[PDB]
Each structure stands twice: as C-alpha cells, then as structure tokens.
GROMACS .gro file of N, CA, C and O in nm:
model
  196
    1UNK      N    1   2.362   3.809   1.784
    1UNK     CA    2   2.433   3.691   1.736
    1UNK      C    3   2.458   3.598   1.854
    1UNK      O    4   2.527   3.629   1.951
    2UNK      N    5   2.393   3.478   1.837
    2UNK     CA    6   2.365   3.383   1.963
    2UNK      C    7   2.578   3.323   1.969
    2UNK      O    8   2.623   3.275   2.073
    3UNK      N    9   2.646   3.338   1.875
    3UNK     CA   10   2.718   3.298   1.898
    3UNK      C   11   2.852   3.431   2.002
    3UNK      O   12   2.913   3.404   2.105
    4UNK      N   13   2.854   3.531   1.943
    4UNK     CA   14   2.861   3.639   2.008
    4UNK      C   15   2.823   3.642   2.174
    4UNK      O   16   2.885   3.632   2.280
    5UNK      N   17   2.720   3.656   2.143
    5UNK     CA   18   2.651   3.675   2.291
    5UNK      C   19   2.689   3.516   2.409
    5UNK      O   20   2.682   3.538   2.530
    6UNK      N   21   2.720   3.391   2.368
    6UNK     CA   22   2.780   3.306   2.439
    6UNK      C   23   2.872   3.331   2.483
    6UNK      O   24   2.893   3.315   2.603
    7UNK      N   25   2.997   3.401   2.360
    7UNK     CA   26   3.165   3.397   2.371
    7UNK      C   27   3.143   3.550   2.487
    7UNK      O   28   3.231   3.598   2.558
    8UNK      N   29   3.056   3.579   2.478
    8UNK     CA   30   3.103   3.714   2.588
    8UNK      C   31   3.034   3.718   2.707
    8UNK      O   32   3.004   3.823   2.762
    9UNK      N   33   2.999   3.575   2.762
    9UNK     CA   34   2.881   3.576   2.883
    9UNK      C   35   3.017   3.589   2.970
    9UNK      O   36   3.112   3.530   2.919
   10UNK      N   37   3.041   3.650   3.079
   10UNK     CA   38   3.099   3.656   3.212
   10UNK      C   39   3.173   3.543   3.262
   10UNK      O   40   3.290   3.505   3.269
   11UNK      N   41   3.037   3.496   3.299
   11UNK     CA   42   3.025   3.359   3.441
   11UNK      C   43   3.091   3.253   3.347
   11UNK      O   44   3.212   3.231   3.339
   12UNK      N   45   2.977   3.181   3.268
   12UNK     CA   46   2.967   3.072   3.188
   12UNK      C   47   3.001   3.115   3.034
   12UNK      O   48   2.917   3.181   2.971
   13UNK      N   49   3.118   3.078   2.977
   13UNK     CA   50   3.102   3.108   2.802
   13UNK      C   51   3.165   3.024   2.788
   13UNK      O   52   3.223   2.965   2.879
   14UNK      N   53   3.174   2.981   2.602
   14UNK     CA   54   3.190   2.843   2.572
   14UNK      C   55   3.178   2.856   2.411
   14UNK      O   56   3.089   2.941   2.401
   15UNK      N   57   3.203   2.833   2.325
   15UNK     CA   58   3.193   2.850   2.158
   15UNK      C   59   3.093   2.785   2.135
   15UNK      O   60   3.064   2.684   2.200
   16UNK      N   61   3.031   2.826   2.052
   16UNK     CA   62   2.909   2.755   2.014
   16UNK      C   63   2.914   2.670   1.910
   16UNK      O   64   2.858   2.563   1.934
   17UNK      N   65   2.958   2.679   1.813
   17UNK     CA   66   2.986   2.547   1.686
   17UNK      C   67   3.095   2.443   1.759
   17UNK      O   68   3.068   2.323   1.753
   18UNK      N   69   3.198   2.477   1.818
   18UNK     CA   70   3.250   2.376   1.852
   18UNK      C   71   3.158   2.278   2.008
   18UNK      O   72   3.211   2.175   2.052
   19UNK      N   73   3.068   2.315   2.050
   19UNK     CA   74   3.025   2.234   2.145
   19UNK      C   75   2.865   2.263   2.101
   19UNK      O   76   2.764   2.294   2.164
   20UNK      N   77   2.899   2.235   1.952
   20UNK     CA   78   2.781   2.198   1.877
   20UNK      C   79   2.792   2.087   1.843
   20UNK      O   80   2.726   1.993   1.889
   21UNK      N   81   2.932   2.075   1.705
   21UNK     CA   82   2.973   1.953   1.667
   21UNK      C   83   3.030   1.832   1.789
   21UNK      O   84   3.024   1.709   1.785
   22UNK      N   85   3.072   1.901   1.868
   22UNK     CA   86   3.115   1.797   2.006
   22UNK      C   87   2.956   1.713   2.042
   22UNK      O   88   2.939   1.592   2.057
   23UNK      N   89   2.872   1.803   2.048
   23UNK     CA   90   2.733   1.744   2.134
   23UNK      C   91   2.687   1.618   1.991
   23UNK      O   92   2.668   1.497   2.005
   24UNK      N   93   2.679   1.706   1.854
   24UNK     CA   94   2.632   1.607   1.775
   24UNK      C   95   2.714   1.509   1.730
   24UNK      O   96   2.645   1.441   1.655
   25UNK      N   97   2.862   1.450   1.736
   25UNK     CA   98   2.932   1.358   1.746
   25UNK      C   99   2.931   1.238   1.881
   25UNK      O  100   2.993   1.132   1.891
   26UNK      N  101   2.830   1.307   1.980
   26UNK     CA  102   2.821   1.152   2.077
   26UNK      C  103   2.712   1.236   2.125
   26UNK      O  104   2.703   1.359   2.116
   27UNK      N  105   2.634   1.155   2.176
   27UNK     CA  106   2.481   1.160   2.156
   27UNK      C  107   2.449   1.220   2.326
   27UNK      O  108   2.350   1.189   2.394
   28UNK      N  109   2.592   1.334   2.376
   28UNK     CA  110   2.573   1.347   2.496
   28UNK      C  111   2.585   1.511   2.513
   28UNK      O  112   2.663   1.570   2.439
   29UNK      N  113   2.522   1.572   2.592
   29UNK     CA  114   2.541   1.752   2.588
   29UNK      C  115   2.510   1.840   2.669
   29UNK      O  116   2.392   1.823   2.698
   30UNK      N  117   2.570   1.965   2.747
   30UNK     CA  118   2.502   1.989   2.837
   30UNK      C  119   2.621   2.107   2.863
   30UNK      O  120   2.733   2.069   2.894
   31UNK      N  121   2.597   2.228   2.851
   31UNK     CA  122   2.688   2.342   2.863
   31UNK      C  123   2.596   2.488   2.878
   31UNK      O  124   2.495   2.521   2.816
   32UNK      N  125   2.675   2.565   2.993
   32UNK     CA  126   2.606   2.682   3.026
   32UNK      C  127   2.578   2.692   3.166
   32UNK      O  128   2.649   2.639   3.252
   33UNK      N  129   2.472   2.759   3.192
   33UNK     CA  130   2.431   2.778   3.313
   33UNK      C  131   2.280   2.815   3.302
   33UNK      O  132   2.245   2.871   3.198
   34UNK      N  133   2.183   2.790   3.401
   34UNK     CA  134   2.060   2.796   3.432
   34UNK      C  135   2.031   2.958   3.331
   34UNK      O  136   2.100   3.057   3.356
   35UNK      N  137   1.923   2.962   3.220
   35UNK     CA  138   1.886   3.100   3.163
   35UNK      C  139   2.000   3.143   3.030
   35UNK      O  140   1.984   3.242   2.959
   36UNK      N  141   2.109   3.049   3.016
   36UNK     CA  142   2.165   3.051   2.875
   36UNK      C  143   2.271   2.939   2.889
   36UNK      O  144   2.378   2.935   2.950
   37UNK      N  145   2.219   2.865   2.826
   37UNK     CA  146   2.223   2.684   2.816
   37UNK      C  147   2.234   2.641   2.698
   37UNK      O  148   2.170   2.683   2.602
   38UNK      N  149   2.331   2.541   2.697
   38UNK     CA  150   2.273   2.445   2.527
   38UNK      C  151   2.330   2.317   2.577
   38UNK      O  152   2.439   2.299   2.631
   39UNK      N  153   2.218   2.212   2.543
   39UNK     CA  154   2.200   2.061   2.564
   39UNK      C  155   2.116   1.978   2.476
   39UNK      O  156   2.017   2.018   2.416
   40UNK      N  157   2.152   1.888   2.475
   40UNK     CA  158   2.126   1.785   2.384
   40UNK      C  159   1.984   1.705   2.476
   40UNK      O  160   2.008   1.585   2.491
   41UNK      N  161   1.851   1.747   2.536
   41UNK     CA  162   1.768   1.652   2.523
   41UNK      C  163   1.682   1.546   2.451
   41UNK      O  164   1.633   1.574   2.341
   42UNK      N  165   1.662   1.427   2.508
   42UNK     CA  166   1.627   1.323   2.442
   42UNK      C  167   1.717   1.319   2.315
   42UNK      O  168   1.837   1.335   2.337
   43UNK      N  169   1.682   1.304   2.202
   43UNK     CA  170   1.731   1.322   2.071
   43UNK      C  171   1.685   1.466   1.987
   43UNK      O  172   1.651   1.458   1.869
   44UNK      N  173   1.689   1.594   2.058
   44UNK     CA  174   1.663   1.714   1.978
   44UNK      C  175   1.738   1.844   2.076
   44UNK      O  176   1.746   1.828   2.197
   45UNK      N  177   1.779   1.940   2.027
   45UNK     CA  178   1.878   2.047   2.045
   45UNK      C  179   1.797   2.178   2.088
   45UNK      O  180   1.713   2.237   2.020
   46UNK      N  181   1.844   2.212   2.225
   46UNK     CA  182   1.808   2.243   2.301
   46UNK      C  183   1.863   2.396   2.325
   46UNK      O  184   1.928   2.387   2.429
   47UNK      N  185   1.870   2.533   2.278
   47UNK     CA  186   1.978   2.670   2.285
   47UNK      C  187   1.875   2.732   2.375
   47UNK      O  188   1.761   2.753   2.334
   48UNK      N  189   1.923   2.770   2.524
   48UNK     CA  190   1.818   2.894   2.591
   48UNK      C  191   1.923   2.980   2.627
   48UNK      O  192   2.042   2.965   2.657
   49UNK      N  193   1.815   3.110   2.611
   49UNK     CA  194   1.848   3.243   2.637
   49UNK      C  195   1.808   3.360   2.668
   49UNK      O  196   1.888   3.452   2.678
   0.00000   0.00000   0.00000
C-alpha cells in the first residue's frame, strides 16, 4: 500500500492524499526524497518508488 509505505518511510514521510489534493489544487508539487518521490511534472503525476 503506496500510501502505507510513504506514512512509514524514516527519513522523508508525508500523507499521500493530502499532498495529492494540495499538488492538484495549484498546479505546483514536489515531496519526498531522491527513490520515493511524488511531483507534479509538466502537467502529469509523477509517484516513484
């Protein structure tokens, strides 16, 4: 569960629906760290892991 597995990263964690709806309410995004990331490039949605 990609949302799971965010809320329990160490270093970098962060909720995932809420800095989902945050990213898709202004057209700006960028959370995580290098190898489990989520950002808003160009105009399309971006989850690595």
């Amino acid at each position: 569960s990609l949302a799971q597995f965010y809320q329990a990263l160490s270093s970098d964690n962060f909720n995932l629906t809420e800095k989902l709806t945050q990213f898709l309410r202004e057209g700006k995004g960028n959370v995580g760290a290098s190898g489990n990331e989520l950002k808003l490039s160009n105009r399309q949605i971006e989850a690595s892991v």
